[PDB]
Write a protein that binds this ligand. Sequence first.
Ligand SMILES: Nc1ncnc2c1ncn2[C@@H]1O[C@H](COP(=O)(O)OP(=O)(O)CP(=O)(O)O)[C@@H](O)[C@H]1O
Ligand SMILES: Nc1ncnc2c1ncn2[C@@H]1O[C@H](COP(=O)(O)OP(=O)(O)CP(=O)(O)O)[C@@H](O)[C@H]1O
Ligand code: NA
Ligand code: NA
Lengths: 375, 375
Amino acid sequence: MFRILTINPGSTSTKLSIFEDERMVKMQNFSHSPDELGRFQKILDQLEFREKIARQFVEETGYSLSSFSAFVSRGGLLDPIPGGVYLVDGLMIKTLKSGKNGEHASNLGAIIAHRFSSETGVPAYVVDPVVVDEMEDVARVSGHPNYQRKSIFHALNQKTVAKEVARMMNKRYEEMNLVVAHMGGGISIAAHRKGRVIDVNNALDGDGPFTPERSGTLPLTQLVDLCFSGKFTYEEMKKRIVGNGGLVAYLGTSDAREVVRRIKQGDEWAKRVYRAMAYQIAKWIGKMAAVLKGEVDFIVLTGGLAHEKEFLVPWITKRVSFIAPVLVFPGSNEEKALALSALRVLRGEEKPKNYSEESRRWRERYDSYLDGILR
Amino acid sequence: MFRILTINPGSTSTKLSIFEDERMVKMQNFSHSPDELGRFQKILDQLEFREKIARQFVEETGYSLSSFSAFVSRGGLLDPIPGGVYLVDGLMIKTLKSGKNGEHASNLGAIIAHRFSSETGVPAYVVDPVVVDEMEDVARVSGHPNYQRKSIFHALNQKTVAKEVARMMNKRYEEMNLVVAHMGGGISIAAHRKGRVIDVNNALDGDGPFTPERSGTLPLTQLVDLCFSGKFTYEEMKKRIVGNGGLVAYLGTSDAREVVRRIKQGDEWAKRVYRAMAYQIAKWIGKMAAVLKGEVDFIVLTGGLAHEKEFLVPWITKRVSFIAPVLVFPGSNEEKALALSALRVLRGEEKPKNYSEESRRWRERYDSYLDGILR
Ligand SMILES: Nc1ncnc2c1ncn2[C@@H]1O[C@H](COP(=O)(O)OP(=O)(O)CP(=O)(O)O)[C@@H](O)[C@H]1O
Ligand SMILES: Nc1ncnc2c1ncn2[C@@H]1O[C@H](COP(=O)(O)OP(=O)(O)CP(=O)(O)O)[C@@H](O)[C@H]1O
Ligand code: NA
Ligand code: NA
């Protein structure tokens, strides 16, 4: 019986849970109000504030941090790496604290687990960071030398549902081909070729179909124009990619249930914009089908939007069932996903990756690719 | 027997030809050197220069402009309109001369035909302008209210090959479903649903797969960043979408035959970038397949790149034949295409559209769509 602690720091919340083997024994979401949050200049300044909530969470359990077998955290903005469960080390910490790859609340998670680790000797891990990158070189070329397509998406949910589909039919994730569509506030559509995400859109940076809250890919010219059109507000213009865009920008809401209600009342602009979102998701799924050369076992719809079975799901299904049957796996459980990955490691069913080495192996391969600087 | 004159003004050249029914009797390309061309401030200033070449072309024929039955020109940057053959009228001229929709050498063609028309009484037409737009509303939504997907591509070649495929099997263009891929210096991939191009990428404005000379769609964030990174050269940064991008930017050449030669010599970066271009064309064809809900009769590869049957064509075919069989229709004949469209009209096999009315009908429909300004 292994007792595990999962750490999941988000932009506006902090989720923690305790697992005893595969059974969850405690979980609590600690939301943070804009007020309470704006009290910090840089994101790193929240470090002690959030650690305090975690120590407190275990504290009022009667258990001590040394009674745990592992501490597991959501990855963060680490350098590109293959999927898997990594041991938190010195290089990871240095990178996270220096925000060399950007600052994000999720970076605090690994740091927090590491300290819990230095005080108890218990192992700390991070699994499937948002920077998981397992794509093929051909997918990196963008059309212009000083631009690269990068793999930045909800890799944890992707990998997790893919393995769930396999396990459901007692097959191996490694022997299938899938098109998995994670449709939440962010939308990533990935091509899984034999356990490897060979191509996917850069969801986190706003590339792809538009979402309930993001605008997704936008017209090039019209952009470079409205770019320096005086309307320049590096911030304002920058929030139209991850904050103020998509359904919320057209209908004034990012709640699908609200939008479906309107469609049932005869709202035509609402239905036209919602239908356009499904239309885009379908197109991208088509892109990924072409990536797999048509060899697709299943198309999987997952994420919050997969719950909407009256319009969205049926619309997508009609357009893409010619590629492969459609399977719906609604939602996503980050806590359970992280704890199980740590259990597999503790049970010796999976080998822990070493971020340090693993990062070098990746950069070495990427650097050989990047050697296109030869004129 | 109808004698027709075709006018085709390009960025750096001017092509004219004379058809007597379906037989071509004279054609000549008048290239214009950067020197000879830079002699004009605005594009409109070339008007008299190019008209002089056309009058001269007919001049040394022994024929007079009044012996013709029609004058046909390549469309230009007119307001959005459905496909077809239009009669050149006052509204078209006003729009072209004022460059309200942008300046382009192709705008001079209609103007030149109109004058030839005012002097002889003979009818002047423009067919399938680059601004043909027959897409469905759902395809217009971009993800953000002040951005629209527009249909701007090589509509003449598109429409022409589509009808050729049909005629080849004695069927009607109006009763088929096709995915036509025009792969030249510009790459447009369009979904033809029963004679109507319901969706296609904005090729002319750099949206889509990268081409031998254009970069195509680029990463959003990385763009908005490099946008105002001091490197700002509204011009320089603007030519990385239609002039300096794509294969030419990576390999230093936009000649596919040159690139194929390198691949045969073992060049690996060359092969990797070329293969990435095919890879992208395939993905977009996948997008259009999803637009047609999988109901695709044929996938058609046309344009210059369709000539390359050693690598490009076979690579695309492998990835997309699961959608529908692939047909290769290399090149494109603009002269023959324009003259035939005028012959059909002169023979009464096709009705001439009226740009004036046709433009209103289009804007009325678009304006109802654009009424999403209701909060
Ligand atoms: N039962 C339900 N019916 C219809 N829509 C639902 C739903 N439950 C959730 N949604 C919708 O699905 C969307 C996504 O929820 P999800 O939990 O995946 O998003 P997220 O807020 O966590 C952001 P991201 O996906 O980028 O992490 C929501 O924005 C909501 O509009
Ligand atoms: N026989 C051949 N074999 C291989 N490639 C060829 C070819 N003939 C032409 N090409 C290539 O195909 C590409 C397109 O020629 P195409 O005539 O369609 O282009 P274009 O210069 O007219 C520009 P656009 O398509 O935007 O009008 C060229 O850029 C060239 O590299
Ligand atoms: Na978008
Ligand atoms: Na591109």
